[PDB]
Design a protein around this ligand. Structure first.
Ligand SMILES: OC[C@H]1O[C@H](O[C@H]2O[C@H](CO)[C@@H](O)[C@H](O)[C@H]2O)[C@H](O)[C@@H](O)[C@@H]1O
Ligand SMILES: OC[C@H]1O[C@H](O[C@H]2O[C@H](CO)[C@@H](O)[C@H](O)[C@H]2O)[C@H](O)[C@@H](O)[C@@H]1O
Ligand SMILES: [Ca+2]
Length: 338
């Protein structure tokens, strides 16, 4: 039996979408309505507010710190906005975080005009082992766009710290890394192999975990789940008629849980649970385990803390859940001897 203790790191957040551990019990968190907050043992501090398109699944979403933070004080955000005509689009912006008096300055847009909608905005951003920023985007309720290489919808993007496509991106002067995605909201890299993984919401069922290759076509909307065709890269997990609704995903690492090292943790929304996936040698799926089914409600992000603790966000205030007292929360999972 897995043995642990769970505390509440923060409470009454409104749809905490993304969590970036700062170290020493400090955390940066986006709330989907349009606020970047600093969580400390001391308390809760508003860093920045944004005028976002806070409608359906759109709003203030992904958050990533520069690999060189706080030395390079750059913070990246993914946010929905109302464009010309009232249409929802998505952008990646960047500011500099003031080391004292935590406030955000010199905010600029890096990437603009990603398609958006009430549904399927993607929105998870994270730096990989290569130092590049990766960005997930959904099909914006327009599935054909996922196969279309001139469209930024239904993709995983890869840009530098400035939002530029590297010369070795798979397509000509294009931020696209992979394509054929429906609504990916979870990415991480295996800490030992550097193999990249992504989660995705499927059509009702057929939620996916994919191993992401450079230039790979993940099939949507021509294929869903394990299709067995040469032209499309199949998922390593396909939930079939079952709905997990996976979002954030992190590989376990650090001191706290040595038995979980190299397992993939996945926060599930409608599934209301923490899935754990054990990968063998050559990234084969050894085991899948399921935790906290319906005890916290909807879960959105999973990140590892500086010490190796498991941080999880609840998402019962997103229009789709039933509230517990003090929702939404950031929970920390530590070892029983902690
Ligand atoms: O709306 C029906 C049309 O859909 C397809 O074309 C659209 O999709 C492509 C995007 O992947 C675009 O290249 C094209 O410009 C869009 O019109 C289909 O291929 C067409 O035959 C249909 O008329
Ligand atoms: O045969 C159906 C599968 O075809 C592809 O997978 C094969 O081709 C890859 C290299 O071209 C190999 O890495 C892989 O091991 C092969 O199985 C496709 O990627 C799969 O999704 C299809 O199921
Ligand atoms: Ca797929």
């Amino acid at each position: 039996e897995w043995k642990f203790k769970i505390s509440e790191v923060a409470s009454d957040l409104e749809v905490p979408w993304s969590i970036a551990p700062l170290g020493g019990g400090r955390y940066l968190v986006t709330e989907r309505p349009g606020r970047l907050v600093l969580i400390s043992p001391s308390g809760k501090k508003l860093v920045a507010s944004f005028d976002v398109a806070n409608v359906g699944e759109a709003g203030l979403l992904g958050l990533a710190l520069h690999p060189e933070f706080p030395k390079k004080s750059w913070v990246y955000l993914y946010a929905s906005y109302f464009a010309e005509g009232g249409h929802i689009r998505n952008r990646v912006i960047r500011g500099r975080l003031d080391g004292s008096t935590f406030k955000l300055k010199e905010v600029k847009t890096l990437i603009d005009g990603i398609p958006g909608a009430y549904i399927h905005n993607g929105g998870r951003i994270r730096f990989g082992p290569d130092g590049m920023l990766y960005i997930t985007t959904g099909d914006a309720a327009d599935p054909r766009l996922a196969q279309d290489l001139s469209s930024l919808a239904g993709k995983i993007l890869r840009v530098d710290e400035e939002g530029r496509p590297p010369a070795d991106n798979p397509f000509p002067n294009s931020p696209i890394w992979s394509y054929g995605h429906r609504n990916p909201q979870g990415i991480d890299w295996h800490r030992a192999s550097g193999v990249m993984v992504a989660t995705e919401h499927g059509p009702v069922g057929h939620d996916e975990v994919n191993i992401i290759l450079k230039g790979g076509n993940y099939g949507w909307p021509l294929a869903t789940g394990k299709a067995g065709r040469g032209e499309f890269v199949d998922p390593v997990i396909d939930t079939g008629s079952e709905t997990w609704a996976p979002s954030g995903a992190s590989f376990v690492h650090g001191d706290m849980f040595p038995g979980l090292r190299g397992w993939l943790l996945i926060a599930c929304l409608r599934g209301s649970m923490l899935a754990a996936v054990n990968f063998g040698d050559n990234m084969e799926v050894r085991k899948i385990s399921t935790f906290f089914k319906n005890v916290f409600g909807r879960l959105r992000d999973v990140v590892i803390d500086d010490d190796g603790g498991i941080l999880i966000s609840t998402s019962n205030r997103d229009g789709r859940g039933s509230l517990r007292a003090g929702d939404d929360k950031i929970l920390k999972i530590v070892s029983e001897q902690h």
